[PDB]
Amino acid sequence: KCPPGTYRNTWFSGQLGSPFITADGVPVATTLTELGSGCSQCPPGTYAPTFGMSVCLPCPAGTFASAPGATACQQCKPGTNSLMGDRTQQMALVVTNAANDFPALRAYTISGMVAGPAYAKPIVTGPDTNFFMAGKSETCSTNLPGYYTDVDGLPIQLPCKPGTFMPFDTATANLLDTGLTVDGTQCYTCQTGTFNDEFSQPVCKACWSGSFASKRGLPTCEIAQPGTFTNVAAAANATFNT
Amino acid sequence: FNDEFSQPVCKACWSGSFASKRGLPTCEIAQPGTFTNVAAAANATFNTATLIPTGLVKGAQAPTPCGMGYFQSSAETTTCTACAVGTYADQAGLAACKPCQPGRYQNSIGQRVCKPCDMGTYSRYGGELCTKCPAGTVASKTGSSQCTPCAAGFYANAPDSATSCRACPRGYYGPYSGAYADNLGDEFEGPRGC
Ligand SMILES: *[C@@H]1O[C@H](CO)[C@@H](O[C@@H]2O[C@H](CO)[C@@H](O)[C@H](O)[C@H]2NC(C)=O)[C@H](O)[C@H]1NC(C)=O
Ligand SMILES: *[C@@H]1O[C@H](CO)[C@@H](O[C@@H]2O[C@H](CO)[C@@H](O)[C@H](O)[C@H]2NC(C)=O)[C@H](O)[C@H]1NC(C)=O
């Protein structure tokens, strides 16, 4: 039997490398084989745990293999997921290689206010294609804005509950306290005077004039009671750079 | 806040309560899962010579929800304790943090996550540690709620905390279910094994 981490099959062999680590976007094919035996080494993203198997088992969602021949793949660290491409690619919209639209992996679509008074839902439309979570052939991607992974090995990044938000980065976090930093494993409550009622929001929502939010992480704004009022001109939602 | 008629100065809300609105007749206490404390919160002292109040320092304005890994069961409080071992608080401002779901465990204080049980072990709700699955039963997957008995004609691979069930080999037979191998003697037989 072939040693673990390798596979022998009549109809195919070799390794198909990770396409998301190459600027071209075309997966480079190699022929790495075990020295003594001769069986082809298991391709990246897949692991061969047992003795003498024909094909390579793709890694389960929430796990990643990055080297040819694994016998097992480790779990994604907390704050990271198992999605095709890194965080930049799956959040990108422009194209570099016109042959195959690389790396416009339009996988992150969030519905919110856009440039101009218009409110688009979702801001990115179309049939989503790059959604695979099993074969993570490269280093784990960072979680998209609005999602978190507290415990390592989670299959899918979970969304932030209403009343909490998660920004893209500390530098770009528009309304976040000075001492708090984001990494991918935390869900911060909405700032007092703001609210949020939708799962997986990268920013809290300003409470409209005539209402108020007197508590941290309020799922819904509070209507001003009779005899009282609130009006702040500067209050406005956060617009999304398309 | 203030509740007495004709006062020359308001009174700061004590630690464990807040006044979120102007002109509050009575300070409102902090609800469970939240705490308020301001050590600098004075109430004015009257200068006996001139009957002038001074020294008032405003108290808490809004409740502070308890951070991740902390819970607060009671109201009127000034701080919240780390969650008891075997339980976790994965949110902010929790009345009483939930116990770890079956198949998980948490052997630490103040954690916001439950670690998953390793292979060959199981755990019900809560759980100090992953229970080593008893003899004759097997838990082949990590985070198993319970470990099932080995089928008749099969035997557990280990005397304690079995990870797989194997068929009795050629020339052997397992009459009872829940058979398990034993290290002592031959490795293919047990007290009820093959
Ligand atoms: C931020 O966006 C939210 C969500 O669209 C707005 O909240 C709505 O406000 C209207 C009045 O303008 C209310 O009638 C709706 O009930 C609110 N919706 C929800 C879901 O709460 C909010 O007004 C926006 N903030 C500002 C400052 O414009
Ligand atoms: C300011 O002094 C007043 C006394 O005039 C305090 O009022 C009481 O405070 C205790 C806690 O120390 C509460 O149990 C009572 O319910 C309060 N009375 C009322 C009528 O509300 C007030 O707490 C003092 N402030 C501080 C910060 O000690």
Side-chain angles (χ1 to χ4, degrees):
Chain A
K1 291 132 163 295
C2 284
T6 63
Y7 75 100
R8 220 193 79 82
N9 205 336
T10 89
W11 316 100
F12 61 98
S13 68
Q15 298 85 34
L16 259 186
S18 161
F20 309 106
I21 78 181
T22 88
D24 191 17
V26 182
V28 46
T30 59
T31 50
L32 292 189
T33 64
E34 205 268 1
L35 193 291
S37 147
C39 323
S40 311
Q41 250 163 344
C42 197
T46 75
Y47 67 108
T50 194
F51 257 83
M53 61 205 318
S54 67
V55 309
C56 268
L57 304 182
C59 281
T63 61
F64 81 115
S66 170
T71 72
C73 37
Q74 316 112 290
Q75 314 186 354
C76 312
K77 266 189 196 185
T80 37
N81 58 353
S82 99
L83 199 56
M84 326 164 84
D86 51 0
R87 199 246 223 92
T88 302
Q89 280 151 1
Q90 59 213 24
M91 227 175 64
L93 293 186
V94 86
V95 287
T96 70
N97 184 6
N100 43 359
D101 298 17
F102 187 82
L105 275 82
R106 339 173 73 206
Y108 173 63
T109 80
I110 176 60
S111 42
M113 258 188 46
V114 307
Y119 164 74
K121 160 180 287 191
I123 204 181
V124 175
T125 73
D128 320 57
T129 67
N130 326 113
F131 40 55
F132 277 135
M133 304 265 277
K136 189 52 194 171
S137 47
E138 60 271 36
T139 322
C140 316
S141 92
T142 322
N143 311 340
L144 312 178
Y147 302 92
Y148 75 116
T149 324
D150 41 2
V151 46
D152 43 4
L154 279 193
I156 169 181
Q157 58 231 68
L158 309 182
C160 319
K161 73 183 284 285
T164 77
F165 82 111
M166 171 74 147
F168 168 79
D169 188 17
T170 89
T172 193
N174 37 7
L175 255 202
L176 196 40
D177 225 5
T178 59
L180 311 185
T181 43
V182 315
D183 53 4
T185 83
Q186 274 274 37
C187 280
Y188 293 100
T189 48
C190 262
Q191 271 267 51
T192 164
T194 66
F195 81 110
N196 178 16
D197 63 332
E198 307 188 57
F199 291 74
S200 73
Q201 290 295 315
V203 59
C204 288
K205 297 181 210 150
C207 265
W208 68 102
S209 74
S211 171
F212 71 104
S214 59
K215 245 93 68 175
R216 247 157 289 206
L218 225 52
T220 46
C221 208
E222 305 177 59
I223 276 297
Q225 279 328 288
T228 77
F229 79 109
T230 45
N231 61 319
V232 274
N237 314 88
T239 81
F240 283 102
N241 176 14
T242 285
Chain B
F1 82 115
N2 177 19
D3 49 308
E4 266 174 351
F5 293 72
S6 75
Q7 293 277 320
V9 58
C10 303
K11 332 176 186 139
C13 275
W14 65 102
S15 295
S17 172
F18 64 98
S20 58
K21 276 165 210 32
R22 295 182 194 69
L24 263 200
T26 54
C27 198
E28 38 204 2
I29 34 70
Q31 275 318 283
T34 62
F35 73 105
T36 79
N37 71 317
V38 183
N43 247 345
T45 77
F46 285 93
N47 182 200
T48 286
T50 52
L51 305 120
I52 285 308
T54 328
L56 167 66
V57 179
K58 166 212 307 286
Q61 183 187 142
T64 297
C66 288
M68 296 255 206
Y70 287 84
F71 81 128
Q72 175 57 261
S73 34
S74 57
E76 78 215 22
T77 165
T78 60
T79 186
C80 36
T81 56
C83 278
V85 61
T87 57
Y88 74 130
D90 71 332
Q91 291 179 4
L94 265 194
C97 44
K98 28 193 99 156
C100 288
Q101 304 191 57
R104 332 293 198 285
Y105 77 95
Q106 178 42 263
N107 63 317
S108 273
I109 217 81
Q111 288 328 280
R112 55 182 184 103
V113 283
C114 301
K115 287 157 247 222
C117 292
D118 294 299
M119 257 205 304
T121 67
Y122 82 119
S123 152
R124 310 306 274 110
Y125 279 96
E128 199 28 72
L129 293 314
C130 47
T131 312
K132 296 282 181 200
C133 168
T137 57
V138 68
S140 70
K141 320 194 308 305
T142 60
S144 321
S145 74
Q146 94 282 18
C147 64
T148 60
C150 211
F154 292 79
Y155 74 109
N157 72 275
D160 210 327
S161 77
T163 86
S164 62
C165 267
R166 347 274 291 286
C168 294
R170 287 174 195 185
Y172 286 64
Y173 76 122
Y176 320 117
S177 73
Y180 64 92
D182 216 335
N183 302 8
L184 53 99
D186 158 50
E187 74 288 349
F188 267 73
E189 50 82 26
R192 298 155 65 77
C194 313

